[PDB]
Design a protein around this ligand. Structure first.
Ligand SMILES: CC1(C)S[C@@H]2[C@H](NC(=O)[C@@H](N)c3ccccc3)C(=O)N2[C@H]1C(=O)O
Ligand SMILES: [Fe+3]
Length: 277
């Protein structure tokens, strides 16, 4: 029945407002838009503008020097040379075309990481959860930021819904000129579209939220629908996805894990994050 996605301000949540609405949302939907956390459309536009700049005007040699050496190294670019381009970075071992690039993207990462820690803090507090070793050690982690740009042109294997392997994930997207929403999830047994919203950021909870809160938070299945050969006049878009992932050494009791419906990939009593990849 219920297929709407609520918006909340983070400031408002930190002041004890909307406690019930937010508790229920987490348990029943695991996803929500969020205002008044320290991100801006502008910050995003400028990080984007700088990447696209490089994509178009970068020497062939410059590009080689920061293309990702191997798929394992999820750092640097992919798909920019001679179904789209992609830039990835983490807390370290990053690759960088220029000095001003380093500064803008390092700052955009820190900001995204500060926001995503803040949201996570709120998700734990709402469900009364103190992970072992404390909230802060848990939240001080090994995150990853994938930015992805789909350019234009004019001259489709539908992948299946997944849940994310993250405490939380934050998505900012620029829109499509043609109104096409490429991002969909399951809210109350239906597929709901999740557009760009002005000065909001989309937030999925993930497996680790479910695990860490003892089952209290849902991790919604979602997928990125590509467009067909008919709605591509004005369908350039970007998204910026930030995975707040735990430290490899984090652990969870396996009775509880399969109890939800996640890939039982290890045959043990309890386990850690890293081997589950
Ligand atoms: C479409 C998405 C927003 S979600 C999807 C997927 N997320 C995961 O499975 C994630 N837990 C993961 C990432 C990398 C290695 C192992 C596991 C991913 O990556 N895609 C994103 C994207 O556009 O880059
Ligand atoms: Fe995902």
């Amino acid at each position: 029945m219920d297929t709407t996605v609520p918006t909340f301000s983070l400031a408002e949540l930190q002041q004890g407002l909307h406690q019930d609405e937010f508790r229920r949302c987490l348990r029943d939907k695991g996803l929500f838009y969020l205002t008044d956390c320290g991100l801006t459309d502008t910050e995003l536009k400028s990080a984007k503008d700088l990447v696209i700049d490089f994509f178009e005007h970068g020497s062939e040699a410059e590009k080689r020097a920061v293309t990702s050496p191997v798929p394992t190294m999820r750092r640097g670019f992919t798909g920019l040379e001679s179904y789209s381009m992609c830039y990835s970075m983490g807390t370290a071992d990053n690759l960088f075309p220029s000095g001003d690039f380093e500064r803008i993207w390092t700052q955009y990462f820190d900001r995204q990481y500060t926001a995503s820690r803040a949201v996570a803090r709120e998700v734990l507090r709402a469900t009364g959860t103190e992970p072992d070793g404390g909230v802060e050690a848990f939240l001080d982690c090994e995150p990853l930021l994938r930015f992805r740009y789909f350019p234009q042109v004019p001259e489709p294997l539908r992948m299946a819904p997944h849940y994310d392997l993250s405490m939380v994930t934050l998505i900012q997207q620029t829109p499509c000129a043609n109104g096409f929403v490429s991002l969909q999830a399951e809210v109350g047994g239906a597929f709901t579209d999740l557009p760009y919203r002005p000065d909001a950021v989309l937030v999925f909870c993930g497996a680790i939220a479910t695990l860490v809160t003892g089952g209290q938070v849902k991790a919604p299945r979602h997928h990125v629908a590509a467009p067909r050969r008919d709605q591509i006049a004005g369908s350039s878009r970007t998204s910026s996805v930030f995975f707040l992932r735990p430290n490899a050494d984090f652990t969870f009791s396996v009775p509880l894990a399969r109890e939800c419906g996640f890939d039982v990939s290890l045959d043990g009593e309890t386990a850690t994050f890293q081997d589950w990849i």
